[PDB]
């Protein structure tokens with residue numbers, strides 16, 4: 001395939017010492033978990049359990065994430081990234097790194113976030129609220145991309161919101177990676193509905209622009225009240241669902257531009273599809289959230305060609321955000 | 325009717341509240357891997373029933389440290405392994421990477437993370453007041469952590485502290501004499517190296533605790549800020565208490581033994597004598613005055629005390645004004 005590189009923050013890691021990005025060589029110091037009293041289970045994920053806890057030294061509430069150590073290199077990667085981004089705008093704050101004396105199970109301690117339910121806001125959210133919170137996500141993405149990091153798992157489950165205080169945090173940095181120009185990455189990242197075209201066609205030389213496709217999927221689902229926007233049933237079908245909206249013409253233009261060999265599994269399922277107008281998704285239930293500015297912005301995010309999508313900085317300058 | 329009992333002021337019941345698997349090292353099952361993955365390079369040092377080597381892990385081309393143990397006491401090897409496994413990953417603690425045996429010899433061997441030791445015999449004269457505060461704080465991080473984990477090191481001395489000065493990295497090593505703290509337990513007093521033994525060991529007071537490590541740390545601090553190695557230069561264990569008494573005085577020694585109803589060995593009768601309490605300022609001279617300050621002397625005074633209960637804990641020591649200049 002034809003090589004590719006990011007249009008922004010291309011050489012940020014190349015210009016820093018190896019200590020910043022060589023996570024494998026990073027020395028992790030595990031403190032004593034006895035300073036934290038577990039209160040209640042908040043959620044259960046893939047190789048992780050989240051708990052609400054109390055720090056007994058200062059009587060403050062914290063969040064404790066207990067990791068099933070299936071991959072040690074992956075735990076080192078998440079810790080180094082969290083340490084580098086610690087304190088950044090709208091990034092979850094790593095407070096401590098601990099192990100229980102008996103179990104020796106790796107655990108990460110974070111700042112407490114008093115989140116509001118996603119299925120509860122849905123009925124009361126205004127056009128302004130969507131513009132406001134989309135801008136808050138963009139602050140986190142322009143910051144982490146400027147720090148040479150791609151999140152690679154942007155989705156509503158990884159965005160915590162405290163609506164009362166109008167506070168947002170981007171969480172779960174377990175799939176994040178350091179961007180190095182010309183590097184070939186694993187395509188088995190992100191969650192099915194938010195996976196970019198480059199991942200589905202096995203194009204390994206991707207960048208920060210992957211996060212911008214995922215952000216576009218979130219915006220489309222919110223403005224149109226259609227969750228998920230691109231509803232695939234497997235990784236191959238996921239590309240077909242995008243092809244039903246963006247057309248089969250631009251998909252071949254994209255694969256030819258980068259000389260990508262299309263998997264034989266796509267032969268009987270891809271078919272032929274026309275490029276659809278964004279206004280076809282407007283209905284009585286969602287029209288109070290749709291506008292010409294919102295549709296122009298969405299159109300610039302959901303594009304097959306990763307190089308053509310708006311960067312997080314370019315997105316922040318769009319007329320959709322003139323009111324925030 | 326015997327000596328008065330004593331207990332630690334901090335982390336008193338940390339092992340009492342944990343299941344037996346954590347602290348019952350005798351019942352611990354050790355799995356010995358194959359030493360063929362490691363190629364020995366050169367000898368680094370030779371100790372009592374142990375030889376330390378620089379080695380290469382042939383699977384990833386990385387340098388490691390291999391400690392080969394002469395198996396004179398099996399229970400002691402199990403104790404060191406369980407303690408190293410419990411503290412694995414803690415701040416400034418040497419990291420146990422593997423536990424192996426050579427196929428032919430079957431000699432027990434421990435594999436650790438690599439530490440590139442700076443030779444301090446020449447950089448001893450380049451050390452600043454800030455450097456001593458910095459490295460003393462690094463040792464305190466290791467001690468507050470191991471004490472919080474219910475473990476006493478019992479052999480704190482310069483030989484058991486490795487420093488990579490270029491990267492400002494410090495590690496506390498050789499956990500072969502370490503033990504689990506249980507309140508009211510009577511321990512063997514034949515621990516630590518002569519110059520670093522606390523008065524509790526010298527007067528045969530067995531119910532000691534984490535505070536023993538704080539005396540040893542005080543001996544290291546005094547030898548550094550005064551450029552006097554060792555600070556308390558005894559020729560045997562009885563003479564070692566006499567060297568301490570020539571500095572702290574004999575009045576406070578009698579107050580200590582009376583507090584705990586300690587019976588002083590008859591061997592001290594003709595050698596102890598009578599000694600005044602010396603001011604710490606008397607040890608200041610032209611060659612060491614650049615390392616001494618009122619804050620350094622107040623901190624030292626609060627570690628080098630006969631009464632083990634009166635000494636600062638590692639956490640209390642970290643809050644002293646001597647460390648106000650360090651991160």
Ligand SMILES: CCc1ccccc1-c1ccc(CNCCc2nc3cc(Cl)ccc3[nH]2)cc1Cl
Pocket residue numbers: 042043044050115117118125129130133134156157158159160161218219221222
């Ligand atoms: C109007 C914001 C918005 C704009 C566009 C697209 C989507 C959104 C949106 C909607 C909902 C959410 C909230 N999602 C919470 C996920 C979550 N993760 C959790 C983990 C735990 Cl352990 C416990 C509780 C947790 N809760 C966020 C956004 Cl950005």
Ligand SMILES: CCc1ccccc1-c1ccc(CNCCc2nc3cc(Cl)ccc3[nH]2)cc1Cl
Pocket residue numbers: 368369370376441444451455456459460481482483484485486487544545548
């Ligand atoms: C300014 C640090 C400090 C402050 C106060 C008091 C003392 C010190 C201090 C000074 C020097 C050292 C160096 N210690 C190395 C011992 C050592 N042990 C080794 C074992 C082997 Cl196998 C091979 C090589 C080894 N080398 C440490 C301290 Cl804490």
